[PDB]
Amino acid sequence: TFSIIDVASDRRLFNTFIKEWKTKERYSLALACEKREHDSDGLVLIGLSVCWGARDSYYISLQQVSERLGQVRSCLSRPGGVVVTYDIIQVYKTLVLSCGISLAGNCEDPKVACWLLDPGSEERTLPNMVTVYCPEELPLLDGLAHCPRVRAATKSVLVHAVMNHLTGLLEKDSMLDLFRSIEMPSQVCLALLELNGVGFSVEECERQKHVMQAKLTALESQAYNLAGHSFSLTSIDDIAQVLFLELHLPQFSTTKDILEKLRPLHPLPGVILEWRRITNALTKVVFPLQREKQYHPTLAMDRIYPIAQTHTATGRVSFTEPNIQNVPKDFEICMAFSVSMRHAFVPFSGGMILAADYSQLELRVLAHLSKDQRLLQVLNGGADVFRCIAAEWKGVDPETVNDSLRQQAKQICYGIIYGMGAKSLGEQMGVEENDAACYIESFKARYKGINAFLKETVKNCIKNGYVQTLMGRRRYLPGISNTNTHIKAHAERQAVNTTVQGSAADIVKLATVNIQKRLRKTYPTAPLSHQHTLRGAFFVLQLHDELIYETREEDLIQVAQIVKREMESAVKLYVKLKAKVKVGPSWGNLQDLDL
DNA sequence: GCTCTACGGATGCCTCACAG
DNA sequence: CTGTGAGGCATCCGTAGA
Numbered sequence: 001t002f003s004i005i006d007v008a009s010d011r012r013l014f015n016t017f018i019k020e021w022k023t024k025e026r027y028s029l030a031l032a033c034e035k036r037e038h039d040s041d042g043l044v045l046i047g048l049s050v051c052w053g054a055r056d057s058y059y060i061s062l063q064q065v066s067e068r069l070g071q072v073r074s075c076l077s078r079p080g081g082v083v084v085t086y087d088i089i090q091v092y093k094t095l096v097l098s099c100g101i102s103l104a105g106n107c108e109d110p111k112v113a114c115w116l117l118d119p120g121s122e123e124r125t126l127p128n129m130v131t132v133y134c135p136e137e138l139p140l141l142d143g144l145a146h147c148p149r150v151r152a153a154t155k156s157v158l159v160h161a162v163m164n165h166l167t168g169l170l171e172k173d174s175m176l177d178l179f180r181s182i183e184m185p186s187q188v189c190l191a192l193l194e195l196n197g198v199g200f201s202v203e204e205c206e207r208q209k210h211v212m213q214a215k216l217t218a219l220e221s222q223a224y225n226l227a228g229h230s231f232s233l234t235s236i237d238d239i240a241q242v243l244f245l246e247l248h249l250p251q252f253s254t255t256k257d258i259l260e261k262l263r264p265l266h267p268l269p270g271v272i273l274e275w276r277r278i279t280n281a282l283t284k285v286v287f288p289l290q291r292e293k294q295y296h297p298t299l300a301m302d303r304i305y306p307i308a309q310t311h312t313a314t315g316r317v318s319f320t321e322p323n324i325q326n327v328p329k330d331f332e333i334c335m336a337f338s339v340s341m342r343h344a345f346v347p348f349s350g351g352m353i354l355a356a357d358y359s360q361l362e363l364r365v366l367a368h369l370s371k372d373q374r375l376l377q378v379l380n381g382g383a384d385v386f387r388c389i390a391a392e393w394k395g396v397d398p399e400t401v402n403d404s405l406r407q408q409a410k411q412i413c414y415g416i417i418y419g420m421g422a423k424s425l426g427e428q429m430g431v432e433e434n435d436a437a438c439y440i441e442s443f444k445a446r447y448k449g450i451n452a453f454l455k456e457t458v459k460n461c462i463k464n465g466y467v468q469t470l471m472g473r474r475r476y477l478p479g480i481s482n483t484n485t486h487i488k489a490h491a492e493r494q495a496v497n498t499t500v501q502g503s504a505a506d507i508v509k510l511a512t513v514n515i516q517k518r519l520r521k522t523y524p525t526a527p528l529s530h531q532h533t534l535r536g537a538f539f540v541l542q543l544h545d546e547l548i549y550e551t552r553e554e555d556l557i558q559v560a561q562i563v564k565r566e567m568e569s570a571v572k573l574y575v576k577l578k579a580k581v582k583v584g585p586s587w588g589n590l591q592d593l594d595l
Numbered sequence: 596g597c598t599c600t601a602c603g604g605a606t607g608c609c610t611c612a613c614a615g
Numbered sequence: 616c617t618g619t620g621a622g623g624c625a626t627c628c629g630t631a632g633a
């Protein structure tokens with residue numbers, strides 16, 4: 001019954017297809033691109049194929065008129081009417097960049113359902129899905145020359161069948177409400193983030209690169225003079241020589257975090273550390289971005305377009321190649337220059353970067369999950385828990401806690417929460433093994449609800465094989481009952497961390513979706529992204545709790561109000577989700593906006 | 596006895612042509 | 616006949632963000 005009839009061949013047939021399509025509560029949509037060139041209509045994208053069910057596929061050719069594209073735009077932009085596509089983000093970007101079509105409404109992606117049912121598994125290709133979840137369609141795998149009219153039909157029907165199976169599988173696991181309402185709208189928001197791209201000035205990048213390269217030459221001159229000869233800084237053998245071979249205390253694994261008893265006294269290891277950061281910064285941001293930089297003519301600027309992965313074990317969002325998330329924070333260079341690779345990321349003319357970062361997000365989520373009344377009452381009163389942790393660690397007043405010293409407190413807190421042992425805590429605090437063990441013991445005793453939550457999460461993981469987040473995501477950890485102690489402990493730490501961190505990721509995704517909905521309510525006429533062609537915000541980057549939006553100068557205040565309200569009202573918990581909003585002329589130049 | 600990501604570089608065995 | 620350099624991947628680790 002596998003049919004590939006072409007609806008876009010007759011006027012009346014196409015009209016009947018459209019009128020039956022607008023009433024379909026759930027259909028499957030597939031791209032059909034004959035990519036003769038690497039983002040066009042009739043040259044790259046050839047058409048769209050549809051599938052309502054019962055092994056039926058209808059093809060809408062975008063080749064040799066525009067009324068078909070107009071009606072497809074009407075159907076795809078809020079015709080119920082859930083459209084399921086394979087790799088929704090790339091499909092959304094292709095539709096936008098080829099025809100300016102925005103998928104508005106309810107969208108679904110079988111990859112997202114497969115990753116919900118097994119976050120730690122491998123990213124199943126569509127045939128891999130048909131060979132696992134829906135074996136009853138294997139003979140249809142033939143059809144993926146490519147002939148994008150047949151590959152699209154086969155992909156659409158297979159995606160429809162696979163998503164129908166995954167719908168029942170999610171209903172069994174009680175993830176369908178989370179999948180339909182939170183996971184997929186977050187994917188559409190990430191597609192909008194990829195379409196927008198983050199602004200990027202080469203002029204700032206060029207001057208930062210020039211200063212960094214001058215510093216690299218100076219550092220090489222120092223290192224070749226500090227030791228006595230001219231070695232190679234990119235080969236581990238040379239660093240394992242001189243250091244650990246002449247005077248320094250230890251093949252030898254010359255890496256970071258051995259700063260103790262090495263970086264003091266002889267200053268060579270500090271120079272090597274600075275050289276390695278600046279070199280990593282260059283070769284992983286500056287060079288990759290200066291070759292991945294693209295020119296937006298309408299904005300008359302340069303933009304970096306990242307690619308989101310979203311197949312994360314804990315529910316986070318990552319980015320490949322450009323790695324805008326991993327762009328380093330500002331660091332100082334002495335003769336003093338300030339390498340701010342984020343400062344190279346800029347809004348359009350007459351616009352401002354707006355960044356809203358969740359304040360102690362995972363602490364609040366852990367307080368809600370554990371129902372720990374102590375933590376709840378501490379963090380509902382406006383107190384900064386990380387500041388107090390740093391203060392009690394160092395004995396200084398909490399109001400005088402450095403941001404760098406607060407990062408160590410954050411690391412200590414989250415590590416203790418997520419299974420850090422006594423040796424690692426001693427390393428990260430400088431205290432002895434016994435002192436670190438007593439610190440973890442008193443931490444669990446003080447926050448009784450948190451320790452009870454950890455033990456109960458481990459026990460329920462052993463009983464069920466999986467852990468669950470605040471909004472229903474399950475991660476299966478078969479190693480929880482493994483006989484080997486190391487694997488069992490790793491699975492325990494992963495279980496607790498997945499619970500809390502996946503809950504935080506769910507909260508962040510829902511906050512992003514709510515912000516986007518409110519922004520579209522407030523600015524219905526604004527463009528959805530920078531590739532749809534001003535007013536509103538644009539969501540140029542996501543930092544796992546932080547949302548960079550790149551708003552207009554006059555709309556800054558209203559956008560900040562909207563963003564703060566939505567990030568605080570995303571989910572109703574026993575905690576308050578205090579969001580910290582900053583604005584500035586650049587990503588690397590942001591000032592706190594107490595609004 | 597922190598977790599997550601990507602990613603490149605590094606190990607670390609497994610196997611195949613191969614030259615003796 | 617057979618060790619074997621080489622290659623061939625398969626993962627592990629370090630490092631930057633979070």
Ligand SMILES: Nc1nc2c(ncn2[C@H]2C[C@H](O)[C@@H](COP(=O)(O)OP(=O)(O)OP(=O)(O)O)O2)c(=O)[nH]1
Pocket residue numbers: 357358359360361362363386410411412414415418504544545597598633
């Ligand atoms: N296990 C672990 N998770 C971390 C660590 N640093 C950050 N994370 C996770 C937990 C945080 O809730 C989440 C968001 O990142 P941030 O570092 O910006 O922290 P948060 O928003 O919690 O606090 P702050 O923003 O400083 O008030 O990242 C770390 O050192 N260890």
Ligand SMILES: [Mg+2]
Pocket residue numbers: 357358359360361545
């Ligand atoms: Mg934060």
